[PDB]
PDB file of C-alpha atoms in Angstrom:
ATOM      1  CA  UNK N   1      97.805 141.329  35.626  1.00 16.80           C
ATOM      2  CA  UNK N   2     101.190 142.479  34.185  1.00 16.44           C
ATOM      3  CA  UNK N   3     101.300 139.477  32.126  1.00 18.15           C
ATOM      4  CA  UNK N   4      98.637 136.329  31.104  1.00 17.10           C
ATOM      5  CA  UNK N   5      99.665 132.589  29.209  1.00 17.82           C
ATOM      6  CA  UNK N   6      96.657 130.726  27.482  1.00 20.33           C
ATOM      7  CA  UNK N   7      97.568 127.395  26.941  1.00 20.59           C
ATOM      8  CA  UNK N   8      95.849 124.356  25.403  1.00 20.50           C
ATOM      9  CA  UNK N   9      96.501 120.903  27.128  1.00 21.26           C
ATOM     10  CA  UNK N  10      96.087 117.786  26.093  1.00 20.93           C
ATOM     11  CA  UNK N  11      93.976 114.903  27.263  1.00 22.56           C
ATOM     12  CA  UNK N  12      96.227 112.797  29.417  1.00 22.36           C
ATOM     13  CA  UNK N  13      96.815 116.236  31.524  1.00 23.45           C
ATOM     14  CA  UNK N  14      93.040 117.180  31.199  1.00 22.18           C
ATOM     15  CA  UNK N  15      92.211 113.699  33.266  1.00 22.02           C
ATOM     16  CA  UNK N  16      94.080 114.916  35.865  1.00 19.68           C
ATOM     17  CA  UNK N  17      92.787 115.398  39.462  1.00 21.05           C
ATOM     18  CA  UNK N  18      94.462 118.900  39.368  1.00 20.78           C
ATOM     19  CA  UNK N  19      94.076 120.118  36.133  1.00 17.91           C
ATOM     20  CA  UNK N  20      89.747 119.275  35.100  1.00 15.65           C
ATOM     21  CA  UNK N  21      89.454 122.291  32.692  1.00 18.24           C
ATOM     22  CA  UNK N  22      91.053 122.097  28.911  1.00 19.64           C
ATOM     23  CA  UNK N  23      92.938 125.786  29.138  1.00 22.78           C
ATOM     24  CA  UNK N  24      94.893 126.665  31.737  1.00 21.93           C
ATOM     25  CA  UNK N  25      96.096 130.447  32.671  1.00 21.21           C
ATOM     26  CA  UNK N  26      99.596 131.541  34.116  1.00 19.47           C
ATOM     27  CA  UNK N  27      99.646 135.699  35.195  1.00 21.49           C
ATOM     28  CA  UNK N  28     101.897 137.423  36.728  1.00 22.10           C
ATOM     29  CA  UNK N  29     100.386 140.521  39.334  1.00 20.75           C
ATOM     30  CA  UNK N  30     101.501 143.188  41.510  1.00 21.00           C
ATOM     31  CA  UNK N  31      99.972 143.590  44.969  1.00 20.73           C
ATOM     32  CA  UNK N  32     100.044 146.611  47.511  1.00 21.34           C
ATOM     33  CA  UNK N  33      98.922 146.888  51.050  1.00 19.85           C
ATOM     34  CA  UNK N  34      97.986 150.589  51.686  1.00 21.14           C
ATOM     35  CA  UNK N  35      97.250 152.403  54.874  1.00 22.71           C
ATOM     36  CA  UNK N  36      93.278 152.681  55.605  1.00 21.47           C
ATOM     37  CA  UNK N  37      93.680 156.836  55.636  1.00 23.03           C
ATOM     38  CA  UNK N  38      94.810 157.180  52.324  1.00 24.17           C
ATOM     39  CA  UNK N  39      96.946 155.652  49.325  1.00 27.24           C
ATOM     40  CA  UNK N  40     100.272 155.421  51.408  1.00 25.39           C
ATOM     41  CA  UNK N  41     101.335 152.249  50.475  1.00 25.60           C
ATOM     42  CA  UNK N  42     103.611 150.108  52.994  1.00 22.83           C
ATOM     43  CA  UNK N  43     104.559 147.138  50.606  1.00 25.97           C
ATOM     44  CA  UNK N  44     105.009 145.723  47.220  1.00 28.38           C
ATOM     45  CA  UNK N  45     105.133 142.001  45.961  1.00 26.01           C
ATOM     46  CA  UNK N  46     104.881 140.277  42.463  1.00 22.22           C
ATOM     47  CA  UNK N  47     102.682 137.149  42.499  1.00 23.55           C
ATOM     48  CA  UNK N  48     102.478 134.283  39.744  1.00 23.11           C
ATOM     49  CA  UNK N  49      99.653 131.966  39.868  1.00 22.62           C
ATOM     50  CA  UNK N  50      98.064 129.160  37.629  1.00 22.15           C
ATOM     51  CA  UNK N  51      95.029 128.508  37.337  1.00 21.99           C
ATOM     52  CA  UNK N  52      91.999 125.884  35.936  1.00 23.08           C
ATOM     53  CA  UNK N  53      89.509 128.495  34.136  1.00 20.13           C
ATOM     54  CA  UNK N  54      86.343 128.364  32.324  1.00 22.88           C
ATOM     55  CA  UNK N  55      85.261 130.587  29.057  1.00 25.34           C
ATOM     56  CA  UNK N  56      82.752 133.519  30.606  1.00 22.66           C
ATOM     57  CA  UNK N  57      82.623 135.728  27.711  1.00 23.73           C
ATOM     58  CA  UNK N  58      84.459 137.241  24.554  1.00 26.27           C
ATOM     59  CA  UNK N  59      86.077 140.578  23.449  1.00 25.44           C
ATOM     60  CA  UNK N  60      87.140 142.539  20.520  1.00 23.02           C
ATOM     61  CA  UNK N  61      91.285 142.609  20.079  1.00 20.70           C
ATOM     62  CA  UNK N  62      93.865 143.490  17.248  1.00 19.14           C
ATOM     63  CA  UNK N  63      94.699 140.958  14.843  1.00 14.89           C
ATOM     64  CA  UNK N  64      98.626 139.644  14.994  1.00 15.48           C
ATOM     65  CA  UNK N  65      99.494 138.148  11.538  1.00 14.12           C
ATOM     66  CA  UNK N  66     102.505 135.577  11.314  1.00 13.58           C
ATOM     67  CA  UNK N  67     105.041 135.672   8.525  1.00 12.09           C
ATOM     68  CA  UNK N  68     103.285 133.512   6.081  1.00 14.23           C
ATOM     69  CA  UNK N  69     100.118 135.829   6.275  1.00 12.38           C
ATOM     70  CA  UNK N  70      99.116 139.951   5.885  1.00 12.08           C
ATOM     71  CA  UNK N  71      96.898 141.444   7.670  1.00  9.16           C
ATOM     72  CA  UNK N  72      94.996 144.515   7.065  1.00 11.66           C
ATOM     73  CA  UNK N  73      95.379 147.821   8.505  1.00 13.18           C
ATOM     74  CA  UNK N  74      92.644 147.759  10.929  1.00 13.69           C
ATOM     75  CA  UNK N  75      91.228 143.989  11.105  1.00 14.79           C
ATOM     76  CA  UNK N  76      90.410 142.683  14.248  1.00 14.22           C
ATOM     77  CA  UNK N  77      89.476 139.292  15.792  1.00 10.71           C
ATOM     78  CA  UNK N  78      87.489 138.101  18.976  1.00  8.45           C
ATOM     79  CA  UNK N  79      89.099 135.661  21.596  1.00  5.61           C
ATOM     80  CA  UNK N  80      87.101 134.182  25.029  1.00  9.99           C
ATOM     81  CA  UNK N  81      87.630 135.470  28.178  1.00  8.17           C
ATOM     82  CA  UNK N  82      88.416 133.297  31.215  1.00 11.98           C
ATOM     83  CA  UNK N  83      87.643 133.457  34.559  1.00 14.81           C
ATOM     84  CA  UNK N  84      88.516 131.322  37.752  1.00 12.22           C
ATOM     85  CA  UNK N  85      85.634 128.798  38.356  1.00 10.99           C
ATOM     86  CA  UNK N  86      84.520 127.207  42.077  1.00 10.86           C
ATOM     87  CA  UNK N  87      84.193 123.377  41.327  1.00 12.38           C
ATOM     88  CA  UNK N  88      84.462 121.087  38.422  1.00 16.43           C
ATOM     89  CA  UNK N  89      83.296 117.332  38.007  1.00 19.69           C
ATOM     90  CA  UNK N  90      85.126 114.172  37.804  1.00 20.18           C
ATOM     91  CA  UNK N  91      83.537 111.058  37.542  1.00 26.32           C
ATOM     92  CA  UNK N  92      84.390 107.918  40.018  1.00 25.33           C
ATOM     93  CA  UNK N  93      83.388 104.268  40.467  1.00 25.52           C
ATOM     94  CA  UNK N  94      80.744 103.646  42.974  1.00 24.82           C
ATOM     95  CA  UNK N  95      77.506 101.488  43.766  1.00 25.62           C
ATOM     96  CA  UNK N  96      73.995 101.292  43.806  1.00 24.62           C
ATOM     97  CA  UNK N  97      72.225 101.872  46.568  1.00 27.13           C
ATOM     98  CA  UNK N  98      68.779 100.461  45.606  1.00 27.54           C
ATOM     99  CA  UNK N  99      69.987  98.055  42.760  1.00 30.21           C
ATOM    100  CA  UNK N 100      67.603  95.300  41.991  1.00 32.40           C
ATOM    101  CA  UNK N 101      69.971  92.614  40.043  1.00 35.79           C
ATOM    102  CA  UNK N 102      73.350  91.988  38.785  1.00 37.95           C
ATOM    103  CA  UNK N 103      73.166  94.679  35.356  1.00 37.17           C
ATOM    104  CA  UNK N 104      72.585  97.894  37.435  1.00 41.22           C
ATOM    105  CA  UNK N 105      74.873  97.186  41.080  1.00 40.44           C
ATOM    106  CA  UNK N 106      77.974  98.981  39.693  1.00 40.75           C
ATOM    107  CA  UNK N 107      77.382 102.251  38.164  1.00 43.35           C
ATOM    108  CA  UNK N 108      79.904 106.001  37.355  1.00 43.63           C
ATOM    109  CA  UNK N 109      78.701 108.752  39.918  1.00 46.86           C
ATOM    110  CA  UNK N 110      79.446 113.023  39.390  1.00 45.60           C
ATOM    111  CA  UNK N 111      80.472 114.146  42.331  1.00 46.07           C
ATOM    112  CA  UNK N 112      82.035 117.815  41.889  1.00 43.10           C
ATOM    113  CA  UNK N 113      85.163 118.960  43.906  1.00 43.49           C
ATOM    114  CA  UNK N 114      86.997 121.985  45.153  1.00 45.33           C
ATOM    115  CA  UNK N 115      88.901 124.089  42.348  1.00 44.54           C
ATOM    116  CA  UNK N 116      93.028 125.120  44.030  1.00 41.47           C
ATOM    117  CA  UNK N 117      95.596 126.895  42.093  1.00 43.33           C
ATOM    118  CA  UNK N 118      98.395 125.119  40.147  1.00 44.56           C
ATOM    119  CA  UNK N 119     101.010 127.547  41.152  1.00 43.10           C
ATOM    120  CA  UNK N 120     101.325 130.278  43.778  1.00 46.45           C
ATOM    121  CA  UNK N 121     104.063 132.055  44.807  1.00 47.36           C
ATOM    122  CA  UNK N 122     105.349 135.425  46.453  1.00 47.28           C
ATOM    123  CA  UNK N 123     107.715 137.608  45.746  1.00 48.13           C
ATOM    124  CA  UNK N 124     108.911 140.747  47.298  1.00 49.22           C
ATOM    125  CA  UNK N 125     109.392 144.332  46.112  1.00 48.84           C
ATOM    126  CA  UNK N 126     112.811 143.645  44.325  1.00 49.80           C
ATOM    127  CA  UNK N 127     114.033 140.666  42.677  1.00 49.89           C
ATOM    128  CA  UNK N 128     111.133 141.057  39.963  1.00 50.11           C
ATOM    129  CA  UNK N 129     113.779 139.211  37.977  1.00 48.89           C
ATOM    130  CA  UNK N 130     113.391 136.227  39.994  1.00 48.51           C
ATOM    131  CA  UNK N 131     109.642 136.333  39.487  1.00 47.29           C
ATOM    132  CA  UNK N 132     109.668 136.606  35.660  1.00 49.28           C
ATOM    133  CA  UNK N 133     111.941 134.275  35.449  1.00 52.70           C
ATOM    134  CA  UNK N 134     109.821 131.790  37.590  1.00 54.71           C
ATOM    135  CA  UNK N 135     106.756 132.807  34.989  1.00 56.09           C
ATOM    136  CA  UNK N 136     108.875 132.091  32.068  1.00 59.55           C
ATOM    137  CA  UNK N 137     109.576 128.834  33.622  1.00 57.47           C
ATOM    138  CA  UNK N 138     106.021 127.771  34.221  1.00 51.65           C
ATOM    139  CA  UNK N 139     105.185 128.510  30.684  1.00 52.27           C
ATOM    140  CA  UNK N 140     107.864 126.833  29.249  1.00 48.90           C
ATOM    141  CA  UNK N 141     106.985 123.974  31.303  1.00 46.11           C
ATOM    142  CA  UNK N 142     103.417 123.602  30.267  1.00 47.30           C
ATOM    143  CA  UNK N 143     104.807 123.857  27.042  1.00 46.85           C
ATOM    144  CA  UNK N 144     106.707 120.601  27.116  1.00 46.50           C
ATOM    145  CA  UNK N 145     103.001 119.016  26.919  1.00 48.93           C
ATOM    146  CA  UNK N 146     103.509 117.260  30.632  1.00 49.05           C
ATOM    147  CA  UNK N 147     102.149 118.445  33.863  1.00 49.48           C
ATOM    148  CA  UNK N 148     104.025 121.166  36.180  1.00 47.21           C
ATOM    149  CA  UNK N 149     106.349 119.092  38.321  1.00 48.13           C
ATOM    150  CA  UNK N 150     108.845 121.510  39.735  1.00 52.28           C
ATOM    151  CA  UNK N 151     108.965 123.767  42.303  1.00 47.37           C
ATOM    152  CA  UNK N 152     111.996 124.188  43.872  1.00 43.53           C
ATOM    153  CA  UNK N 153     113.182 127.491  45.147  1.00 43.99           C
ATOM    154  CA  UNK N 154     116.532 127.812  46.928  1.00 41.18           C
ATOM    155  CA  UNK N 155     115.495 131.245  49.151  1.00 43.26           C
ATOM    156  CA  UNK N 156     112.769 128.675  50.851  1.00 45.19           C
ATOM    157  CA  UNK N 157     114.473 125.669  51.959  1.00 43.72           C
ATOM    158  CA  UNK N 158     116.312 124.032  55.089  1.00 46.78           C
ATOM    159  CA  UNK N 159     120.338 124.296  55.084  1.00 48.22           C
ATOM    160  CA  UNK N 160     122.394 121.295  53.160  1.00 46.04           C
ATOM    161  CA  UNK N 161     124.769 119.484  55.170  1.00 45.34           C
ATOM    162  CA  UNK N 162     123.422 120.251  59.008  1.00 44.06           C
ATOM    163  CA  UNK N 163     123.603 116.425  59.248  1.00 40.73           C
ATOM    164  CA  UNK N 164     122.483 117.497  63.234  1.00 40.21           C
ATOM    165  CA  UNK N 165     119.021 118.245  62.071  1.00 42.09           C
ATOM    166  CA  UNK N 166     118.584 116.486  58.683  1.00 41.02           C
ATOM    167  CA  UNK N 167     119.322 113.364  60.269  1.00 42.05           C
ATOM    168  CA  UNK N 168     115.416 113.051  61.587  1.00 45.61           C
ATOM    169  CA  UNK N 169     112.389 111.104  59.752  1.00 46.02           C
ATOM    170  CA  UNK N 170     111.092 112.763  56.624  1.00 45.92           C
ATOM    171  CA  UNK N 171     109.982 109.542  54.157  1.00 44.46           C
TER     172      UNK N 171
ATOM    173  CA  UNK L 157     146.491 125.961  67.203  1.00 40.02           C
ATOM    174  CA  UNK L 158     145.784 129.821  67.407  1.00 37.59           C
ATOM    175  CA  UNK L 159     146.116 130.795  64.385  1.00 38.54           C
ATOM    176  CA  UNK L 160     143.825 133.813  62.555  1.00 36.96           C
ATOM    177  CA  UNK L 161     143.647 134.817  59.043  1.00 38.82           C
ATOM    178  CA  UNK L 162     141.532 137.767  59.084  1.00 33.63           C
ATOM    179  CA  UNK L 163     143.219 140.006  61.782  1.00 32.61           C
ATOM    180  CA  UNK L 164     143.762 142.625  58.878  1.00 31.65           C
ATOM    181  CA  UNK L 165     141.859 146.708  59.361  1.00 26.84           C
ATOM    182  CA  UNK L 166     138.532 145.446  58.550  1.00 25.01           C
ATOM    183  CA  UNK L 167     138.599 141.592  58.656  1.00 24.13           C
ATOM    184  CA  UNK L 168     140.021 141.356  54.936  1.00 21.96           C
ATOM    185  CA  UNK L 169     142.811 138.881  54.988  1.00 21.82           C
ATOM    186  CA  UNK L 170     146.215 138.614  57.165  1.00 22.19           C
ATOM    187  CA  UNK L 171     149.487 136.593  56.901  1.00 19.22           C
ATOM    188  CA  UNK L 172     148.150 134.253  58.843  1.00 21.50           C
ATOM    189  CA  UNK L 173     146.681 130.366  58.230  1.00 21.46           C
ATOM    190  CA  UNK L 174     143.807 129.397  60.250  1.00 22.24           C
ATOM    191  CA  UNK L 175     144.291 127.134  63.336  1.00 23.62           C
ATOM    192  CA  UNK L 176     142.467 123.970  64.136  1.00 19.27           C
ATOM    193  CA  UNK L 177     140.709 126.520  66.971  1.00 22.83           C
ATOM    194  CA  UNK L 178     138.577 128.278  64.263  1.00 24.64           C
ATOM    195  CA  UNK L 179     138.405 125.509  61.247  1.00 25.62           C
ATOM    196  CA  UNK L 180     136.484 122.903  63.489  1.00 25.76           C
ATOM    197  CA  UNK L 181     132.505 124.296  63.435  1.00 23.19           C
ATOM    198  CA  UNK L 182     131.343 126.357  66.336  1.00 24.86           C
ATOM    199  CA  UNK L 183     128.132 123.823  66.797  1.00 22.69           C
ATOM    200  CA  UNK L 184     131.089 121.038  68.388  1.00 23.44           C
ATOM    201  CA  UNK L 185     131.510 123.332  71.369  1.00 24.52           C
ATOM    202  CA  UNK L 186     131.029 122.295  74.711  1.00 23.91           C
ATOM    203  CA  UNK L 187     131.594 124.328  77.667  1.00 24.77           C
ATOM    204  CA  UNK L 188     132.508 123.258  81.071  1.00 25.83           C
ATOM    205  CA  UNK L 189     132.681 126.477  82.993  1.00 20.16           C
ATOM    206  CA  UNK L 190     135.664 126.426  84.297  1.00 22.42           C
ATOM    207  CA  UNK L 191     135.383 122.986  85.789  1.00 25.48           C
ATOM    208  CA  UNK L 192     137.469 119.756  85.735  1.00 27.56           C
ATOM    209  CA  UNK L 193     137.047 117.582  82.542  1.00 26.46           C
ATOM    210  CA  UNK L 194     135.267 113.939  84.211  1.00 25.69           C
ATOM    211  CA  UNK L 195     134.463 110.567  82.736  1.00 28.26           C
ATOM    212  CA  UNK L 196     131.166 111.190  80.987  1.00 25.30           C
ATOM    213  CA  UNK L 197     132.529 114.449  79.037  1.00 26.99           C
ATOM    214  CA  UNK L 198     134.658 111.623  76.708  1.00 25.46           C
ATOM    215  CA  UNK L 199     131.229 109.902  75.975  1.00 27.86           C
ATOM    216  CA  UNK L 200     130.077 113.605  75.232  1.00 27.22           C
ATOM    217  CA  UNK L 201     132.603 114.108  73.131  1.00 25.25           C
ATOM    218  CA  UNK L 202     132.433 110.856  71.205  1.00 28.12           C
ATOM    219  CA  UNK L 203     128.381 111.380  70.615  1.00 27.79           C
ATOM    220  CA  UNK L 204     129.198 114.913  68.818  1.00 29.39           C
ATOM    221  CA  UNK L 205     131.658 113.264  66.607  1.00 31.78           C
ATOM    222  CA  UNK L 206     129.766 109.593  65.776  1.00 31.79           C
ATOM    223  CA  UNK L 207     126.552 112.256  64.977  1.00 30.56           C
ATOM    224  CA  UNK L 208     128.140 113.551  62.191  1.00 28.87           C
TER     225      UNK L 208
END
């Protein structure tokens, strides 16, 4: 994990369907595929991700002052760790099953669903460029205090004007 | 009609303007094999052009 965004968001993203977790993580990651012999590697790619993560522990790290404070020569402060969870609950409208009047028919159930990545995309051995930049967007994007809502990359799409094949239903 | 603008060493630039031959796209092509042009090639014809 070359690099790693904790963000805070807010509650109108936190109700989300995607986003059910108050922090959410952007890294950025290197991957190799190696021959089963011995370390000769065959490929390189750069991965960035986003994930929904819960708190699972807490560590020891330097303390960073800002301009309007000092910091001593050794202090230290303790941040969470995060981890990737499996499911989270949301809770929907549903009914009773053995209801006996009209004050308990119509109730809120917990059901708990299946936890998918925000973000993931590949990247190949060069162009780490294109993948930082791509990071840098994400955070910057969370950042606005909205949800992640673009993901348009020009290497992965259909030609513009081949009116021969874009001419067929999409809607 | 025939004319080529990159017939320079290496396909760099000549002193030559294109020709309709090379400016219309390759994909409106149609071959007929050395065979006499018939009724339905106009229809043909018209369907590539009204497609686009």
């Amino acid at each position: 994990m070359l690099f790693k965004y904790i963000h805070d968001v807010n509650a109108k993203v936190e109700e989300g369907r995607r986003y059910l977790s108050d922090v959410v993580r952007v890294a950025l990651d290197k991957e190799e595929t190696t021959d089963p012999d011995t370390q000769e590697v065959t490929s390189t790619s750069y991965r960035v991700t986003a994930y929904p993560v819960v708190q699972v522990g807490e560590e020891e790290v330097p303390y960073i002052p800002v301009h309007p404070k000092t910091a001593e020569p050794g202090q230290k402060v303790t941040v969470p760790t995060y981890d990737v969870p499996e499911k989270l609950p949301v809770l929907v409208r549903g009914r009773n099953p053995e209801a006996t009047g009209d004050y308990d028919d119509h109730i809120w159930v917990t059901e708990e669903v299946e936890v998918r990545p925000l973000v993931d995309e590949v990247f190949k051995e060069d162009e780490f460029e294109k993948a930082r930049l791509y990071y840098e967007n994400v955070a910057a994007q969370l950042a606005e205090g909205d949800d992640i809502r673009h993901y348009y990359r020009k290497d992965l799409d259909r030609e513009a004007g081949h009116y021969s094949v874009s001419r067929y239903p999409s809607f | 009609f025939w004319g080529d603008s990159k017939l320079a060493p290496g396909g760099q630039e000549g002193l030559q303007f294109d020709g309709i031959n090379k400016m219309i796209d390759p994909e409106n092509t149609i071959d007929l094999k050395g065979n006499y042009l018939e009724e339905k090639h106009i229809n043909w014809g018209s369907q590539l052009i009204l497609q686009n």
